[PDB]
Amino acid sequence: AHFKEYQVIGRRLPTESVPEPKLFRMRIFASNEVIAKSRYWYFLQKLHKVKKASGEIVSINQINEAHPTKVKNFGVWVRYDSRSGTHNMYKEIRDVSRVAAVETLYQDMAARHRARFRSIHILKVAEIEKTADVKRQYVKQFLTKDLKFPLPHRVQKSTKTFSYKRPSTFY
Amino acid sequence: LKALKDEKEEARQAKITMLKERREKKEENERYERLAAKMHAKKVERMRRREKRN
């Protein structure tokens, strides 16, 4: 599904003589608000000893893209705990928004690495501003000046089940 | 990185000296004291003079 990005803040519950703990905040990519809070307490157990019943959400908010038209160049840290112990992975996606990029990555990870949605930590998604900081080859491919390329073998989707023309790619 | 990496490692590695040698002292400091519990204490502190010799 088409995700969303979520600022999620939790503060685990003030007790007597401990008012006001320190308002922990994460950036969560998820579909809806329910999965995000479910995803939220999950990280909070791995980081340290807080648990879901012990605390509460302060607030949750959706992060829109600041420039949803500008094509950006994204650097992504992913580590994941397979098949033996974990390891990082850095892949670069030329894309439009933050939430656009993660979508193809989950398409990518489920393509090659049989990676579940649970299997994956998104550590950090960074925009590369400056060209010639983009390191992968195939992202550097589309950056040369005055890019032109053909489409070869243009199929045409037929509507009805018959045609009379021996149709040809067009061209 | 590597400079910052080793001092993150050597403080771990210096503790392997300091913390284990704290125990291996106190592990033997209970050893003869457990041996002192049965046998007479004039004999044990006599034996403590034997161990300090060499």
């Binding site: 650097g75 840290w77 850095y90 960074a126 590369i128 900081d133 983009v134 390191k135 | 990185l1 910052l4």
Partner: peptide, 25 residues
């Protein structure tokens, strides 16, 4: 292989610059 990588090292420092000072005084 990550471009914005050297920024992260000082962010490890500035949290630990406090943590040496905060636990004592």
């Amino acid at each position: 292989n990550f471009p914005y990588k050297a920024k992260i090292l000082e962010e490890i420092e500035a949290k630990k610059m406090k943590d040496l000072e905060e636990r004592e005084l």
